């Protein structure tokens, strides 16, 4: 597979996830992987139909991110995500509200879209 086609499919998966989040209503590759790991950890705490589906989609998207990273001759292992009681942080000045979480995730994906168009670092 060409790396061009990997980039195309990553952008397409991002657009799919963004439109799915619509229907319900960072910079380098490492920071993107970390953001998606954190969002996976969040989504696992509020499991519904669409939330489980979005978390699985994010797993695939992270796999594609790592395909790109390895095509750029640079390693960035599976980001752990959080340091870890979820409920407290999530309820207060955080996420928890399923809509708020999905909106923050939509914004992060939309930023990743532009950043991937810019051939970002690793």
């Amino acid at each position, epitope marked *: 597979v060409p790396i061009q086609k990997v980039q195309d499919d990553t952008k397409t998966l991002i657009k799919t996830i963004v439109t799915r989040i619509n229907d319900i209503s960072i910079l380098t590759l490492s920071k993107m992987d970390q953001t998606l790991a954190v969002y996976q950890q969040i989504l696992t705490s509020m499991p519904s139909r669409n939330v489980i589906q979005i978390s699985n989609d994010l797993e695939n998207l992270r*796999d594609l991110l790592h395909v790109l990273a*390895f095509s750029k001759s640079c390693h960035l*292992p599976e980001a752990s995500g959080l340091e870890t009681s979820l409920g407290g942080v999530l309820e207060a000045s955080g996420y928890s509200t399923e809509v708020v979480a999905l909106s923050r995730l939509q914004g992060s994906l939309q930023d990743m879209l532009w950043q991937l168009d810019l051939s970002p670092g690793c």
Partner: antibody
Amino acid sequence: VQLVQSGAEVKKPGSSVKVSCKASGGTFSSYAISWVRQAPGQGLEWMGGIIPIFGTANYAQKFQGRVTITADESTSTAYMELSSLRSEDTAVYYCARSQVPSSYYYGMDVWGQGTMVTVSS
Amino acid sequence: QSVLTQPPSVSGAPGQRVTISCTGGNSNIGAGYHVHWYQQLPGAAPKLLIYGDTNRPVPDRFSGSQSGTSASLAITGLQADDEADYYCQSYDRSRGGWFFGGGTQLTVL
């Protein structure tokens, strides 16, 4: 690249079996290794997978609780252990390396020869 | 019961075009995720024919297409060597797993 598997095995109900999948010239840890079974006259059944460098495995809901997928990056060998063997498990078990590095998004391009495991009293 | 559905058998005479289908729901073939096609000859391990709906690793006689919640594999100019089992694979997002189809035994008459 080639994936070489252990030899066939005959086991009895209740016992367990462990099938191996060694590499023959590849960055075994960077890729993904899937385990797929096929009973006689039935089709392929995705049992699970694992990316060795990351260490975390994924299992089909059907085989969850009875299958364990592990990987040894040193020997570049994956292992699939099935416990509490039943008559229905009689089948050929394949291991398959994905086409691109760490993802099944683009298929599995390097399959193994298959290991026949027969469960009968 | 496999998530992906295929015809149990299709048959054609040499030189004929054959089409094998692979239908599912919006959680697998629909919603972006692709459909791979694997060929398994009598007494052999599966081989990757098609990945990502259409791409080939494979003679140009094999081809793939995807529409809605269906995908299809076309074998033009059927040969004696194409007689084999054909499995479609796709990612189910409700079950979280790259699950295969029931498979289609392609016979050359």
